[PDB]
Ligand binder design. Structure first.
Ligand code: 5NZ
Ligand code: 5NZ
Ligand code: NAG
Lengths: 536, 531
């Protein structure tokens, strides 16, 4: 010390860190990457809740991203940006409990609102190091303190033998909670305000944000929340204690593990990480799409009851939520799983293929429930039309898994005291490599919220750069005040809060804000009110 | 003595009356007997052909109206009184009426046979709305209308019994169709070009003549206005007919079939009318006590089975509905509804109404109805709930059974033409919320706006003329389109692929696609699966 940049030297509870000065289009940013927040969850610690990281001696280098949590790498379309952009960009390791911090350069003089990003990837994949989650633009342009963490995914994060000591479940959510705890204690050293923390996430990340809202020990660690294309409630974000027990026992059999839970978990702990990844998908109860094997469990601990019971009975008076969806939530889920669908053709399907797809898309549906889905989504004027059937299939999956669980959450939070702001993202990136029939697929709003169009080397249009700047302003104004609206800008269209009376939401596209009413109201009344009665 | 008023039919000589229509005279032969009076021992029995008479039979006045329940709900109210009997009630009522141009046509003329509605418990061929004089004068048509037995008299059945076999009111109708074949040529009518037309229970009757082989040889074309043989109200099973006749017998103090039927035959007509409504299995609306029975005789199977398996290649059918089929059915039966207030109902009142409107519906089926018809943007809005209640009743009872019939006839070889009547008579005394209620297109088809004393607008007179042309062109050719009008828009046939129908209102024809397609997929495909 003494020859290095004094603006990049910081101390945390665990010790000294050395960060890196990064270039963002408009100027420098301070980045502290790969900070350890927990004891490596390896060996005897596999399946166990995280332990806080013991202090270190000397200056820890925090200039590079750390290991990505052990997961299944997508090799479906080799060289394809559409799939490769989501793949791990660092080495896979069980030693992965690290977090990243981006702050303005020089570090802010007064306490600054903090944004904590929780990534998606069906609770089996993801990393905080991906290029779409780059906090440098938000830190530079908006002056934000951005934090992102790695949490255990798959069997490593969510394999549960409910009631056991050794594998209690939801440990990946506890990794997230420990990083929220770390922010409270240490973010002030970076110029961050621990008294103004906003959680934001997408897909499984949004479901994770939702589970922090529904779990009392997490509520003291944040003030506001953003749930993008994901919710704690719904058909995929959780499993029962019985279902998690079933899936962990089946995986144990599959890898040669046999009679109490201690014996079974000890044997699972001797298995190489890849053996577990190789059998992960083989525990699903049916042929399905938008279903993940190891997800949060309703344990009676982290989740005191189902997220459905919790959202219907909870008091959310003190809460501000920003929720929303993309135009085509379900389109991507059809390419691996539904026969007749491909990214390399227009995917014009037959009626038989549509009926077959509804059984895959709604796997828990009875013959009668699936018929109600088919009859609702058929256009009885053109019941055999291949383009309509193709789109209806996308809508079934999108509506069942995302839009209607989002509408249900917005409705319940608003009715029970929260301040809700709802959106629909309708802009398809000019740079998208997925076919046009897929529209705006699941996760393709992220690059805009994070401000990637501001980098001139990424070849986005001028319109897309102005639009990204607009979105970065909505998100950070929401983090700052609990309202996405700019107080100085009187002229710009206001984003009204979502209410049960008016059911107002906005469209996020290249045009100025548009206020719309009812988030897929007739269709979501079918999924949220009728279909549960067709489970009797 | 006018030679244009003396006709010799197989039963003997008749004398009509020269009537005045706006444009000129018409010949009318009213109250012609077509059957032996169905009185005494003949009560509940199939009709017998009328024995010949001596001299010249007077046919200058309408005859007795078949014995029925008279609506006394709103006394002096045009809205209800226009449907009430306008002649004396009697069991001696099997008479028909004939209207022809004056002088009688020189060449054989297409015949239109009108079959009235009234839930199979009421109606008469003598009502002012069924006046054939305009169609006879303006279009040169030979119009025939008959009285058929209604209520217990026409449809009380002890299935399998010889003395009360059921469907005798439909046999009264069939005998009048037989009479037309045998005698219409004496009036200048073409027995080889006979079109049946009817509304509500009359349309369901027309539909039952299509589905019953011995009737099929008596007509060539058909018009089903706001009614169908299929659906929840037009028929009952042999079992249901049996319990209702047994219950009614018990209610009037009666007493095996022979014994029970003989006791019923000793009862005065009004004693049977007094208990008629008390045999319905639930609190319901758009449900009638004595209706056609699936006997395995007149109806060889249910109208559903018959419409799904029938060959209709040789048939031309004109079908349609009115804008607000169910609105009227809500005033007597559904709490919160009235003709004297705007009927803005609550959510509770709507859920309660769905149980009355869909009486066969289980708790789950009724919930599916509620969830489908609720506007989830305004789920508590009283105007939406009021209007949704009207739609439930109209869709369940008329629009979706009509869509189902049109789809099946088209798929199985018929030529079908479908419409929606959206014009509300300027003269209507029912409140505005009721819109275009059940039966208010009839006065337009019959050409009543052409009479200047009835106070209809000029627009309504041009519109009635248009409709009279559609109906008579359909009777003439099996196509409602005018070959004279070498201008657009043409009325396309309804097909299962294109699902084309037209709107009948003051504006020129508009071609629309799918008759409430999504909603009727719910009633016709999903709801039957519950259970
Ligand atoms: N060997 C084997 C054996 C059995 C099965 C499988 C493979 C695979 C598979 C195929 C290709 C790549 C990865 C997994 N899937 C398909 C699983 C579908 C996962 C889709 C998903 C859901 N959340 N993240 N992902 C993948 C991660 N990538 C994405 C992510 C996001 N959006 C995306 C948009 C397009 C393309 C990829 C995206 C937003 C959030 C971050 C992750 C299965 C699906 C089922 N139901 C059963 C068995 C298997
Ligand atoms: N004393 C007693 C005991 C129990 C019950 C009743 C009466 C009455 C009743 C009330 C007034 C008049 C007649 C019957 N209704 C209600 C029945 C409503 C029948 C509605 C109907 C169906 N088809 N024709 N009509 C009546 C005839 N009038 C009309 C007709 C048509 N359109 C109309 C439009 C508006 C008003 C009247 C119209 C087109 C076809 C010709 C007949 C009941 C209904 C139920 N469900 C149970 C018991 C009774
Ligand atoms: C698209 O490709 C898949 C896989 O090759 C195939 O099953 C499907 O039938 C194709 N669809 C069209 C419309 O060509």
């Amino acid at each position: 010390e003494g020859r290095e940049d004094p603006q990049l030297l910081v101390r945390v509870r665990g010790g000294q860190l050395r960060g890196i000065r990064l270039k963002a289009p408009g100027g420098p940013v301070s980045a502290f990457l790969g900070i350890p927040f927990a004891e490596p969850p390896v060996g005897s610690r596999r399946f166990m809740p995280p332990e806080p990281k013991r202090p270190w001696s000397g200056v820890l280098d925090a200039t590079t991203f750390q290991n990505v949590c052990y997961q299944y790498v997508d090799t479906l379309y080799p060289g394809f940006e559409g799939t490769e952009m989501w793949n791990p960009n660092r080495e896979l390791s069980e030693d992965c409990l690290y977090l990243n911090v981006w702050t303005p350069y020089p570090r802010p003089a007064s306490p600054t609102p903090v944004l904590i990003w929780i990534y998606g990837g069906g609770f089996y994949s993801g990393a905080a190091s991906l290029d779409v989650y780059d906090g440098r633009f938000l830190a530079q342009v908006e002056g934000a303190v951005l934090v992102s963490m790695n949490y255990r995914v798959g069997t490593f994060g969510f394999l549960a033998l409910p009631g056991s000591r050794e594998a209690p479940g939801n440990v990946g959510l506890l990794d997230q909670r420990l990083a929220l705890q770390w922010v409270q204690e240490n973010i002030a050293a970076f110029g961050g305000d621990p008294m103004s923390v906003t959680l934001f996430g997408e897909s499984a990340g949004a479901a994770s944000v939702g589970m922090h809202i529904l779990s009392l020990p997490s509520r003291s660690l944040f003030h506001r929340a953003v749930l993008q294309s994901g919710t704690p409630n719904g058909p995929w974000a959780t499993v029962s204690a019985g279902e998690a027990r079933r899936r962990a026992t089946l995986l144990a059999r599959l890898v040669g593990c046999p009679g109490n839970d201690t014996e079974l978990i000890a044997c699972l702990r001797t298995r190489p990480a890849q053996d577990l990844v190789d059998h992960e998908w083989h525990v699903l109860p049916q042929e399905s799409i938008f279903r993940f094997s190891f997800v949060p469990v309703v344990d009676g601990d982290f989740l005191s009851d189902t997220p459905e019971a919790l959202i219907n009975t909870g008091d959310f008076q003190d809460l501000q939520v920003l929720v929303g969806v993309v135009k085509d939530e379900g389109s991507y889920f059809l390419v691996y799983g539904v026969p007749g669908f491909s990214k390399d053709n227009e995917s014009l399907i037959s009626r038989a293929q549509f009926l077959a797809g509804v059984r895959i898309g709604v796997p828990q549906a009875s013959d009668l429930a699936a018929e109600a889905v088919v009859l609702h989504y058929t256009d009885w004027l053109h019941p055999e039309d291949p383009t309509h059937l193709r789109d209806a299939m996308s809508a079934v999956v999108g509506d069942h898994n995302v839009v209607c669980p989002v509408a249900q959450l917005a409705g319940r939070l608003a009715a029970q005291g929260a301040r809700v702001y709802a959106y629909i993202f309708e802009h398809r990136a000019s740079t998208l490599t997925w076919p046009l029939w897929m529209g705006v697929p699941h996760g393709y709003e992220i690059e805009f919220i994070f401000g990637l169009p501001l980098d001139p080397s990424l070849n986005y249009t001028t319109e897309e750069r102005i639009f990204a700047q607009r979105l970065m302003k909505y998100w950070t104004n929401f983090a700052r005040t609990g309202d996405p609206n700019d107080p100085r800008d009187s002229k710009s269209p206001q984003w009204p809060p979502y209410t049960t009376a008016a059911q107002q939401y906005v469209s996020l596209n290249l045009k100025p804000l548009e206020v719309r009413r009812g988030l897929r109201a007739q269709t979501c009344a079918f999924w949220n009110r009728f279909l549960p009665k067709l489970l009797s």
